Amino acid sequence: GSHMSKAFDLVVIGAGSGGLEAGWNAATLYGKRVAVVDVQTSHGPPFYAALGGTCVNVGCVPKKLMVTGAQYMDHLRESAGFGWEFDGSSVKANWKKLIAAKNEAVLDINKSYEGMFNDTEGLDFFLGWGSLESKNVVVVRETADPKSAVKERLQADHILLATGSWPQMPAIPGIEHCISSNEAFYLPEPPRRVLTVGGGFISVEFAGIFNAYKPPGGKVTLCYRNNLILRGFDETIREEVTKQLTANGIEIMTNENPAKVSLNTDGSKHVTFESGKTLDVDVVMMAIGRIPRTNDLQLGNVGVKLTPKGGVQVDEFSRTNVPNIYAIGDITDRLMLTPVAINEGAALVDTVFGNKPRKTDHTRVASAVFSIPPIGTCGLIEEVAAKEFEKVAVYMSSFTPLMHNISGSKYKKFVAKIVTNHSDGTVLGVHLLGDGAPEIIQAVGVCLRLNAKISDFYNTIGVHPTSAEELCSMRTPSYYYVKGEKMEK
Amino acid sequence: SKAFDLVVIGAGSGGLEAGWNAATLYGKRVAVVDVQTSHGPPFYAALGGTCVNVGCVPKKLMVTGAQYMDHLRESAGFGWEFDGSSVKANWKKLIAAKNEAVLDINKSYEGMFNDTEGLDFFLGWGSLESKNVVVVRETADPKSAVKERLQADHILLATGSWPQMPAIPGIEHCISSNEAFYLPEPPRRVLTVGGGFISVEFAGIFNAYKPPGGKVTLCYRNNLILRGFDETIREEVTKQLTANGIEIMTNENPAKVSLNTDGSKHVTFESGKTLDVDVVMMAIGRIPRTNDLQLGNVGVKLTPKGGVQVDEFSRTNVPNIYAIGDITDRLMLTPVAINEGAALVDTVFGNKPRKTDHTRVASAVFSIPPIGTCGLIEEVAAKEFEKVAVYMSSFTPLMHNISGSKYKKFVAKIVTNHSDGTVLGVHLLGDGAPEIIQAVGVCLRLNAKISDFYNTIGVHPTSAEELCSMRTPSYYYVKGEKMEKLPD
């Protein structure tokens, strides 16, 4: 006869930044029975993400290590200025060694998270592909093909969709000759010539990475379809980052977009842009965007509605149009950042299972770009602020620090900008570029949630000598926007 | 002509801020006096002050130089390969690059005087002749040729401080940090005497630039270095200096230093223990530089400590004579002195009176690895508040597991008044700590609570995000008593 399905208060689809924080909190804080589904228990091909999520397996965590590795190129050169001497012709960047180090580090996190499943009562992990068979039934199948064999049918009171996002690949001829960030983490050799396609943080970060590790006579090229990389970021910074990448030897192609790629005789790639221009490279890494990973969930089975862009539509509390079905993290197409997914999962579990309804605040969120040098930022850019306030003030400091006069890296301009509501002094945004920018910016996030005014920044006594003390020496606006237009008046 | 709205004795952090605000923001006629136009022997400090010439600015460059000892080694873990045995640390190169950068700052400060109307600079030694007279003499000797007398509406004392040298026999064979900046070769064996930030910072510099077989020793007369800093961090920095080869000799104080014929120094400690070194750098404290001012001539009051006494608005007992900066023997920090000077000018020549806030001042120690701190340490908090909670996070970041520097724990601590959640102090150890703390200083002006920190979304991956991931206290103090759990 028949026998019982395994049953849960909460089934989470995707063992990532957001779904792990939800699953953990529901099990350990509210004594719920939780199932969590993911397609792999450790990182890498075939599926790249795995137990742990995108950040842990193929984003924030391995990239940062790789960016840190890339920084030694600068450090070794800059040390001469302080008197370090050594045989410069003996220097070699060993990519294989970096990839192996990073692989070990990620696997340890993978194993560690599996151990925490094994050790936590009421928190179960399920290996495979999850989808919605009906409103309270989650099936887990062998592969993403909806006709592959069912492994388990889970009864679920509540279902959380947290499958994250996936790299956008444009439908152009030869797209199958390109890679994404996923494969970039697994290249067996460092590419000699690479094109990173796109202007966002992922394209920019990997360009620096590839730039540090490329072999003899290699060349890194980045293309973006518009005028100026890093759309969404402060404008001075977009321009500074452009020049500083260039200065470190990276070719920026603005106003270009690939129209197709063919394979050369020798296995390299021959890229033709929309403009008629061409470029031959060993690697084409597409990083033009990430799209909500919804295709495998079978949402039609239950009528979960999407937005026009393709994300799962949700209210401020992460609820879908179907009761007992929720969605958080990249699948919702808000801010695609790990600590927002984390914050979203926690808020959702407080709301549904705790006694503290709460909604995630998506404004004033701090974030970074680990370019070399990095960007740290929190809040509104000046052109956004000008459109929402009658009188905006901009304070700006920008100078090559002294250490970098001695180091020889003179192109390294530090930029600090504070954007105010000039009617009351409220700080709306802070924008930084230069060494340590991502660390400086964290407590600025706390500042904005405290409705800090410019006078709070300037009244604070500086720590000397730092870059950060620039945020506390600015008293006079560099310029303003008055009902939409720039001046010093 | 020889009459000025303001005379500043000491062209330093505090004095030059005051000298510049008065002339540029108020149109006052200003005179500033200093002993030397650029850095170095004989007088070390000069135009720019201590920070520019023999303090924050050159030491930060030199600690920056010292960090490459770690960087070169840590690079192997990330796949970098080069001939380790060809590595050499060239001190003369470092000192020459430091000297050039500092000289550029002297020169550009000289430029701004020459180009600025009613801001005048005078070479020599300033002393108070009468209430509205400042004499500039040739040397620090009262009895040497007068160079100028300047009539002064208002007088600012900003002569700063000077290394304290204890009266032990053989003190004359020891140096201070002043000479340390100009050593022609890096010492092979060096004893840094003091538990405070100059000693600790210099110990890390010498440790990196030391020749083969060299050894750095730091000594401190009490049990634990960095008195005044977070206890966890004091212990943790101690272990990480030891892991990088520096010897920490606590509970020891030099009683005698004698000179070997080969030029080395033979140090006898109070314990009767002895040690031989090439250089003994005394960094046991810094005292207010008041001896050459001739304060007797007008009776400006000094505290039982040596410092010019002042009220909150930098006023001495002699009307129209003010004191700011290390001469006041309070917080000896460049940006404080700068704040004091500007607040004083706002008060004397401006609209609104203004007083410097001495509480919640963020500061750093550029040790390797470095410290960033703002506000109260827990044991001081436990004396002023009935329930205090401590949130702590301490672990070796992942980059240092790959780097091979496993000993490098990052420490983050928040101290609250547990009754209302107000953040009383934050204390940090690890790469980035001086940069991370700056904006914490602002949070504390805004009376931030622990929940304001925890509710802010992290920037990931950073060390700083650790400040925004703490919601459960690690331990507490109740009525001064340390305990893990609250009692009820």
Ligand SMILES: Cc1cc2nc3c(=O)[nH]c(=O)nc-3n(C[C@H](O)[C@H](O)[C@H](O)COP(=O)(O)OP(=O)(O)OC[C@H]3O[C@@H](n4cnc5c(N)ncnc54)[C@H](O)[C@@H]3O)c2cc1C
């Ligand atoms: C290259 C790169 C670098 C990044 N760097 C940063 C950074 O520095 N800082 C930062 O904050 N963010 C960074 N991010 C973003 C961050 O990774 C995401 O915002 C975050 O992981 C989203 O969390 P999530 O909970 O939405 O989903 P994820 O963490 O992506 O988890 C989704 C999981 O679901 C699994 N899954 C998918 N479909 C199914 C299915 N049908 N059944 C079962 N399991 C399924 C996937 O395997 C995956 O493990 C980066 C992203 C990338 C690609």
Ligand SMILES: Cc1cc2nc3c(=O)[nH]c(=O)nc-3n(C[C@H](O)[C@H](O)[C@H](O)COP(=O)(O)OP(=O)(O)OC[C@H]3O[C@@H](n4cnc5c(N)ncnc54)[C@H](O)[C@@H]3O)c2cc1C
């Ligand atoms: C090694 C070292 C490292 C330091 N690092 C830091 C740091 O990292 N961060 C920080 O905030 N602080 C640091 N400091 C402290 C900082 O330098 C001082 O707090 C600051 O410079 C004090 O400023 P001041 O205005 O009181 O006078 P100073 O900057 O000390 O200026 C005093 C000036 O007066 C001159 N003078 C003295 N007597 C006379 C006279 N009678 N006539 C004419 N001129 C005279 C001297 O030439 C000197 O230029 C450091 C100090 C030292 C010694």
Ligand SMILES: CC1=Nc2ccc(Cl)cc2[C@H](c2ccccc2)N1Cc1ccccc1
């Ligand atoms: C609290 C927590 N939240 C997570 C958020 C995002 C990720 Cl990718 C991982 C975790 C992690 C975790 C690990 C296994 C199962 C559930 C949660 N986890 C458990 C944990 C406890 C103590 C230290 C580190 C991790």
Ligand SMILES: CC1=Nc2ccc(Cl)cc2[C@H](c2ccccc2)N1Cc1ccccc1
């Ligand atoms: C405003 C200002 N304050 C100082 C505080 C401390 C020091 Cl050590 C130096 C200055 C600096 C200055 C330089 C020459 C004369 C007076 C003041 N100065 C001038 C300046 C203007 C713009 C950029 C940098 C320095």
Ligand SMILES: [Cl-]
């Ligand atoms: Cl290689």
Ligand SMILES: [Cl-]
């Ligand atoms: Cl040398």
Ligand SMILES: [Cl-]
């Ligand atoms: Cl730092």
